[PDB]
């Protein structure tokens, strides 16, 4: 069994949320994923996605692909991560924006 006295705080795994870490590209509106993530999420090249972070903060960024990126990581640059009020090793959800 498990101790459920603190059963609310822990996150739940989902194919809609990934982990945040460093990247290479340094454009203010780009984030680099792995193509397997796009295949799982049914996302394609050049799509503009919505990123939701801590304390009800969110932004819009263009998602590109690279083989170097790992599937459970998002490779978020420093500027966007600062805007999301997060640090490397946290959980960030991803969605798609239909209206540019």
């Amino acid at each position: 069994k498990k101790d459920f006295s603190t059963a609310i705080l822990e996150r739940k795994k989902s194919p809609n949320r990934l982990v945040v870490d460093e990247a290479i590209n340094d454009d203010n509106s780009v984030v680099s994923l792995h193509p397997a993530t796009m295949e799982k999420l049914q996302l394609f090249r050049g799509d503009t996605i919505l990123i939701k972070g801590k304390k009800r903060k969110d932004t819009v960024c263009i998602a590109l692909a690279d083989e170097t990126c790992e599937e459970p990581k998002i490779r978020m640059n420093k500027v966007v991560r600062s805007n999301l009020r997060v640090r490397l090793g946290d959980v960030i959800s991803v969605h798609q924006c239909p209206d540019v």
């Binding site: 498990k2 459920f4 006295s5 059963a7 609310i8 739940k12 989902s14 959800s93």
Partner: protein, 117 residues
């Protein structure tokens, strides 16, 4: 008709117990086993609960409890039942599954845990 209410009749003004003002004094004491059983049966009428609920055991185990404390115990049991299901419900999704919402029922173990707490 005037109906007072207090906790210790000694602490009231001694001049209010004279003939004609407050001449009847009734002592609503702590209920016994059957009283606690009836209070629990009254309070758990609306809650969903499985057939395993053993209200007699809960009544016997609770000693020194009053009606308010038994209402608190029932609320604690319901909250414990929700908390045990919390491990599968996701707070980010307000669309809780309908079958999940109707698959939650309080049992005897949750009552025992709430009594312990």
């Amino acid at each position: 008709i005037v109906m007072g209410a207090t906790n210790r009749p000694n602490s009231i003004d001694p001049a209010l117990r004279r003939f004609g003002r407050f001449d009847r004094e009734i002592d609503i004491g702590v209920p016994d086993e059957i009283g606690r059983l009836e209070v629990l049966r009254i309070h758990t009428k609306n809650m969903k609960l499985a057939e395993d609920v053993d209200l007699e055991r809960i009544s016997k185990d609770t000693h020194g409890y009053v009606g308010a404390d038994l209402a608190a115990l029932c609320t604690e049991a319901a909250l414990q039942c929700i908390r045990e299901k919390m491990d599968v419900i996701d707070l980010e999704d307000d669309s809780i599954d309908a079958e999940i919402l109707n698959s939650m029922a309080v049992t005897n173990e949750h009552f025992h845990t709430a009594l312990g707490n």
